[PDB]
Ligand code: HEM
Ligand code: HEM
Ligand code: HEM
């Protein structure tokens with residue numbers, strides 16, 4: 001997908017303003033709490049019986065760091081996303097056996113967390129641009145399934 | 147997607163056994179009756195208030211003929227489906243504005259009608275092969291959306 | 293939720309189905325397993341061959357549960373609270389696979405019942421199975 | 434359907450929302466229109482600019498309907514039978530767009546309410562909006 005120069009400048013500015021530690025942890029914790037069946041893959045991380053424990057789990061943040069790093073790399077390489085999201089796509093298709101709905105669910109949760117952190121600076125144009133970005137990343141990462 | 151020679155022989159035999167007149171009409175009528183919101187595009191065809199009128203509408207069969215012809219062409223060209231389903235994909239993306247769920251709904255309805263007509267000859271292996279075929283056709287036809 | 297016409301059609305369809313429920317359920321399980329191999333990871337202790345005793349028993353159990361649900365169509369939560377708790381808390385199954393199972397059941401009952409599989413019965417069965425899956429996929433109490 | 438904790442959380446969240454409902458609904462409409470341009474074909478007689486009087490009025494009407502639904506959370510069909518009939522028989526809208534509207538509403542209430550948008554409130558609002566959309570998308574009577 002193509003983006004206008006103004007949209008590119010806006011998304012680059014906000015991403016530069018993003019704190020790169022707690023956003024991924026918040027996204028993962030909110031996903032696990034809101035959609036409970038997603039714990040079938042993360043049950044190896046320890047206690048997840050209550051949202052307090054889910055948010056306080058250290059492995060949740062330790063994995064959200066890698067998730068947000070992957071998102072940052074994908075955002076850095078927007079022109080070629082299929083080439084960048086190849087090994088991850090193969091891993092998800094082969095070992096994890098995850099249907100592609102969870103990818104868009106995680107993207108929506110990330111957009112919600114971004115809006116929560118940035119407040120009124122999340123204008124509708126920037127929200128649309130980030131929706132396009134997350135849709136592109138999800139489609140690139142889930143391609144072998146269909 | 148690749149198919150084994152035995153699956154190819156089975157699907158070719160059954161498709162050769164298919165009646166090429168009423169299957170498309172039955173598929174379209176069953177789609178319209180089961181999922182009522184799909185009439186938002188076919189409201190130009192006349193009276194569709196009851197399933198009896200929906201099945202008796204002549205334009206329903208006259209359009210099911212073309213739908214089944216397109217499916218037959220796609221089945222004939224299995225190796226290259228993106229090249230074959232290009233103009234139709236552009237038309238559906240531009241003018242009709244149809245989300246890709248209706249494509250898989252129509253594929254499932256077609257498989258149900260095939261099972262109904264053929265009875266016990268619709269073995270689980272043939273059912274799986276036809277599911278693969280319809281999934282491939284739907285994915286090839288809906289590519290510009292995502 | 294459901295119209296009286298839909299309820300009557302569903303009751304008539306299941307009454308016509310009758311005592312072939314166990315075989316129909318076993319066939320639906322086999323069809324699902326062959327068609328979609330991504331749902332075979334929920335049964336790691338089974339022997340998913342053809343004509344398996346364990347698969348036949350599970351199909352019979354599913355058929356009996358569906359028959360009870362039909363007999364209590366207006367009281368789905370009270371009838372299937374235990375099943376809902378087991379499927380939501382212990383197994384933790386996503387609601388995608390219920391669509392595949394419903395479609396396979398529709399195909400199975402369509403293959404051997406050509407006379408009773410009218411468009412009205414098709415719509416009624418679709419809505420009834422969707423309601424059953426929705427009731428079964430919930431987290432309450 | 435809904436737990437008492439979820440009901441209490443939803444009631445508290447909407448009570449905190451209070452009288453900003455009209456502006457929140459208008460903002461949700463604008464967000465949906467900008468984000469997804471495929472849902473602009475249901476409004477062919479509107480002027481979908483920024484700060485439009487008609488868009489503001491429609492947002493206020495949507496907000497009032499949502500407030501009534503909150504006030505009658507346990508009686509959704511009896512409260513919204515007319516809306517369900519209008520949305521299912523006349524307009525004939527597919528249930529996909531309700532997900533987009535719900536997500537846009539969630540974003541809108543998250544942006545302006547950082548204190549009350551805890552994970553529990555997030556889950557409660559998600560389930561409540563899903564239930565409202567499910568009730569509104571039906572064909573009964
Ligand atoms: C949507 C964008 C996503 C991205 C960019 C992403 C990226 C990643 C990355 C970078 C890893 C680690 C690779 C490594 O360590 O070598 C990973 C593994 C994993 N992913 Fe994803 N992922 C996404 C979505 C999801 C979703 C939605 C789920 C589940 C619902 C999921 C489940 C997992 C699991 C369970 C692991 C392995 C965790 C572990 O081994 O401890 N991923 N993914
Ligand atoms: C799933 C496989 C599908 C195939 C192979 C297919 C194929 C076709 C073909 C061959 C035409 C006519 C093109 C022409 O006349 O030049 C057409 C048009 C059309 N299609 Fe599709 N289609 C599919 C799915 C759908 C679905 C699911 C819907 C709606 C829910 C739909 C709605 C329409 C409409 C409304 C028209 C125009 C009818 C008219 O102009 O009278 N199609 N499609
Ligand atoms: C759609 C309607 C369904 C009904 C009516 C149903 C009903 C049942 C019943 C009656 C049992 C027996 C529980 C027991 O004996 O303790 C059961 C267990 C089970 N179900 Fe379902 N089920 C449905 C769908 C599914 C689906 C779609 C899956 C997986 C994709 C699934 C996975 C399981 C598993 C793994 C068990 C445990 C089997 C065992 O422990 O031997 N169910 N279900």
Ligand code: HEM
Pocket residue numbers: 472475476494495498499516524526530531534535566569
């Ligand atoms: C999700 C919750 C929704 C609620 C609570 C809601 C509520 C309402 C209300 C109160 C009206 C006023 C009816 C009247 O004044 O006669 C209305 C009309 C309408 N709604 Fe919805 N709606 C929802 C979703 C949607 C969505 C997602 C769409 C389209 C994508 C939609 C399309 C329309 C249209 C086109 C009208 C008619 C507007 C007009 O005639 O001026 N609604 N709705």
